[PDB]
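User: Hi! Is it possible to get a structure for several chains at once, not just one? Here's what I have:
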Amino acid sequence: GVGISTGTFNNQTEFKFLENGWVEITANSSRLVHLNMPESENYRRVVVNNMDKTAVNGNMALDDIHAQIVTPWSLVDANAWGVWFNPGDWQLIVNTMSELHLVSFEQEIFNVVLKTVSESATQPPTKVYNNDLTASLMVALDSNNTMPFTPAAMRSETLGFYPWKPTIPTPWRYYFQWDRTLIPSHTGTSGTPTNIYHGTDPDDVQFYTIENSVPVHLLRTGDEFATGTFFFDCKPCRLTHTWQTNRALGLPPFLNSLPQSEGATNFGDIGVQQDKRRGVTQMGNTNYITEATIMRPAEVGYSAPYYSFEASTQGPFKTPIAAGRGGAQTDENQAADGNPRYAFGRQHGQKTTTTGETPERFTYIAHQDTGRYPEGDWIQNINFNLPVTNDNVLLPTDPIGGKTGINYTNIFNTYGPLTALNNVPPVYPNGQIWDKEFDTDLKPRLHVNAPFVCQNNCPGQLFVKVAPNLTNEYDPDASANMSRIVTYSDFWWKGKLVFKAKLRASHTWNPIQQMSINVDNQFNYVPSNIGGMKIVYEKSQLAPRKLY
Amino acid sequence: GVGISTGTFNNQTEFKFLENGWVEITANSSRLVHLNMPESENYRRVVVNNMDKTAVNGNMALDDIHAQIVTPWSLVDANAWGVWFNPGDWQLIVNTMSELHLVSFEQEIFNVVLKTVSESATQPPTKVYNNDLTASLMVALDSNNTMPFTPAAMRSETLGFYPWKPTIPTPWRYYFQWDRTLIPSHTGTSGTPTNIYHGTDPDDVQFYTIENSVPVHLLRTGDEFATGTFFFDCKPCRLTHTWQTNRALGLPPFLNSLPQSEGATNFGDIGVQQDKRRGVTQMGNTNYITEATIMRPAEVGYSAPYYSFEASTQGPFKTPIAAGRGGAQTDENQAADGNPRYAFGRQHGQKTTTTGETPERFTYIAHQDTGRYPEGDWIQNINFNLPVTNDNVLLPTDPIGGKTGINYTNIFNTYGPLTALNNVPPVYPNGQIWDKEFDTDLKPRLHVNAPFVCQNNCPGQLFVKVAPNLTNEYDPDASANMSRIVTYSDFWWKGKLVFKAKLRASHTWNPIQQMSINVDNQFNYVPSNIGGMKIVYEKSQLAPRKLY
Amino acid sequence: IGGKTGINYTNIFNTYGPLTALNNVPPVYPNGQIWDKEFDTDLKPRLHVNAPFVCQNNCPGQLFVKVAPNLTNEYDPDASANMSRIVTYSDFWWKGKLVF
Amino acid sequence: PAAMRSETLGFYPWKPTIPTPWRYYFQWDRTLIPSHTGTSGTPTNIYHGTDPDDVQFYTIENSVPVHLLRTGDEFATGTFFFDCKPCRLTHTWQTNRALG
Amino acid sequence: MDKTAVNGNMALDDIHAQIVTPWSLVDANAWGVWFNPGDWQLIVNTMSEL
Amino acid sequence: VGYSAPYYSFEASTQGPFKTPIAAGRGGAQTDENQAADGNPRYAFGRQHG
Amino acid sequence: LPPFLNSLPQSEGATNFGDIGVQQDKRRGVTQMGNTNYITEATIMRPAE
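Assistant: Yes, the chains can be modeled jointly so their relative placement is included. Here is the combined structure:
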């Protein structure tokens, strides 16, 4: 009814321990969503063109030319870790569990309130907000996944992370087809390369509308819309990292001489010469069996061509890399490729009382040792004389193509049938939870943006829009814009995400690295005297696991 | 039989998760115990007298005069935390659980081996060790608790903490009655005070023997002795600490002025004068309602007379204190009373390859804020004029009895019917697990040495002794010592301690302090290149809990 | 005591013992508290000095109330300023029932 | 408990009342050395800060289910049942000088 | 701290830290909420335990 | 019956000084409003509460 | 548990005493003095009073 509520606020996460060390995690989340009427009631087709920026030779990485369809609908997106967990629940899950399953997902909309602004133009020009009890909110649930899938976590435009703060939805848009061609150059190149935007191929035109595809529900004040329960079928995401490289697989060599005194410089020693040892190598012309030459079962990780831009029908793009380097060799100073860098605003983890429009940034360096250190690689000739000569090695200090800043590791690629690698780790709080698999014949082995991939079907997207509120003067045969009453809405969203985890067990004599609070990160978890909150990122794969 | 084994080595700890968030922890432990034949086969009554040490005036804290009965039996004692858990299992229990129950306890002895040394006196004088298949080992289990209860963890004489290292049992002894009287003095006292050892009261003489009290089992090589399962009935031991003092109980005052800018120096302010506020105090002649004067429901902790030696029938002793101070005010520099100090050797956590006979020491500072800071206490007159006068306060800088190093906090005592306090926390690895309740009419509310107190009955003590191996020449009517064959033994001990714990839950937005490994304590959990191991102490009450 | 003429030994005296008998606190009309919560500690106090009844295992839960946010048309969560709301208040009726 | 700050509901049934703005204590560390009037120098009057081992930040939203009430709505707590010792309405007069 | 900076006034300490929440509390834990002086006179004069 | 407590005794701890609570104070023929005592509570309140 | 005696008497008499063969600052056990290495019979921790 008019003065009857249709739902209940709930933002609790529960832990229900089953038998055999399985625990059912059910995270609830509720928000207050503020929605304005759209700027235009029509679908647009806008072409973005920053050709003045890439007209300077060398700046071809800054390309932004694309085409998109601007729709009057808005999207409610809750596909991020920080929507469902606070740092206490995340510390509990990360420290106590070993693997994670994704079970189900629901959402609903209740307690709709529509108000109209009537700006009484005084000399202090005021505005009185009145309830419009007969206005409607239009809600479309794309359960068959007919619309193009747009995850909002990649643009940092999901729901907010604080339960006591009102949030906004994202204006929806999708990509339209275009053709462009950009020839690269460098600073000090004679002439201008081709920088051409061709247009649209008629064989690839797809124009989607919400009205022709999805049934749209009209919600007044006493109405309530509830999505049913979707059920996932996914692979488990493991909360442990591996440390073993190719240099630490299998049986170590037997030491015939052990140290007799304590110290960091009392080393052990194999008492056999390198040309008198036993074991298997893969060098048919070499009697040396060392730690770098001994045969391993497979290879962990691979080398990829890093900072490689590939061009296609719609312009250049960067090549994605599955796992980057990180650990004792690389810091914030030592720049690497493969580690993602997140940017976000005050709604998603930045300090709420900060000044300026510069976002907050961090680079996520994972714990799994599956990367490569490109400054220590080399090729050598198959003759394999051990004091190697100048013209028999390919070093990373040798120029490729005459360019002194390019070596062979920039174009190297060692992916093969012996390559083993790991899935991507979850990133709290800004990371995505699930993702959709590509509708192609040969599917990729992993995604670099989400730990779960719903294979057959994913949860349908939820669209929302304020219904048009017309005035007395309205002529559809006139070419001008539709004149509407200034209306906005407030509704309550409530979701429920259910997981399933397994409690970890101790295997070693020594303790394990855990997530804790100390004197350094103390004031990152409490509000300030004004109420400024923030959410700093936390690691997810803390405990180690033996690979082999 | 002779060539048949009678048991299985087991040193695994299991975690069996039940329903409703309860987990059954079952710790197994196994050792190899090395036992020699006793020095004498008789019971002795030895009186220890260090009267030359306390003959100097002022050293009366160094009293060691007592009397004891030296028995030829040895004790197998496994009442310590480090016998049952490694640091990985302790990290799991401390980080994941909230309370701890003690359920049952078993032990057994198997695979007995008795050998005789026959020293063939050559010029390199050798010794050949021969199996004596008909020798016996005597095992007595005092299941009715007839012998006096002696816990070996208070003298650091339990079993070892490493499963791959052979251990020894403790030679048993108990206290005999004596009477002594020592009058204290100081350096520069005219004359000598009374330093007299009187003797034994005949009303209090108790001489216990193992043979007249306990049935003794004789074990040959094919024999095996197994204690049954004892079942505890105890209160649960909680793995969370409290932080709330008397200054943080109840509703805070309402602030009429909040800060407008961020900073450590933008304070809030109650906008009411101290003589115009509302609330309840306990001062009938004072209109001031401040944070120190406002009525609280009860009192947390108490003041005790610290470093107070009390004298009785058998000499002076220190007064035990339940909870000492510790935290932001006290460090290793700022000495305190109430916090225990442990000393131990290479078998119990010291570095195994260290040099010297100086033991390893640490002071255990707990996390629970239930102590007192004696430098900030004061008494004042009941007239309560607020700028207080010199002769109306009792300060800790005022001398008591004319002594400049003694103030009133050394003789103060504020235990009352309003005092609330907490049980003692477990100390890993050197701390005791269970303790026996006193057989008196009015029992103490807690013990300062063990978190569990078995009230009605405790597990019985296990005594062990090599049976006498006589030679051909033996005359009992001759006053000389019995001549025996030099014999020793090796047997395997195996115990099983079962607990019950409850998994913790998250309640706050912020994370909780956990136990972790880092770059500082990294090499405390791995062996060295010689095999030197150590066990450093770990805290047990890490998470906080609201008191009120 | 200690050379101070305004302090005697009764200010530092304490004669609580195992022979001490004493009474519970009396109710104070009208300003006094009715019930109180027991401390969640291992060794609990024998009485409280502020309420005659102490609910030992559990006490009645507290009741919190708040007016829901009433936003205007201009609202930007990415702006560091304060949320602008419509000035709202409430009136409700409370009704309790205590049985002795 | 709000009775210790004199901030409960009103005592007259025919008079409108207000509720109390909620707040709780956060952890801090401070140290104050006492003195008297006419003491040479200044004692230590230091506010240290917060211990990270004792930080507890509670919110209503993450802990309690919150009901939304419009005009036609009504919220009713169930019946809680106490288990307490009886409070006696008689006093004792006998000292140690009047026993036996 | 300006109040307790004068020597001798250390009973007037008010330094603490608190969390200020936007919620309000309905508290009816007092004797005067439930009884008028007539009912209190009846209970006090006629009864012995409660 | 009853006990003696250290009266107007301020104890200090981690978070500052506080007064020691006393269970029962004196009162009767010897003590009046003039004769100040310790243990008896003192209430302050406003127009809403009496 | 009493302390272990490393030297027992060899003759009978009221003045043939035993002796702990460890110095007072070299013994093991639990005390309640955080600033003292001496473990004597008056300093050693007892369960209650």
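The CA atoms of residues 2 and 49 of chain F lie 33 Å apart. Strands of chain F lie at 9-13, 16-19, 38-44.

User: Great, thank you!
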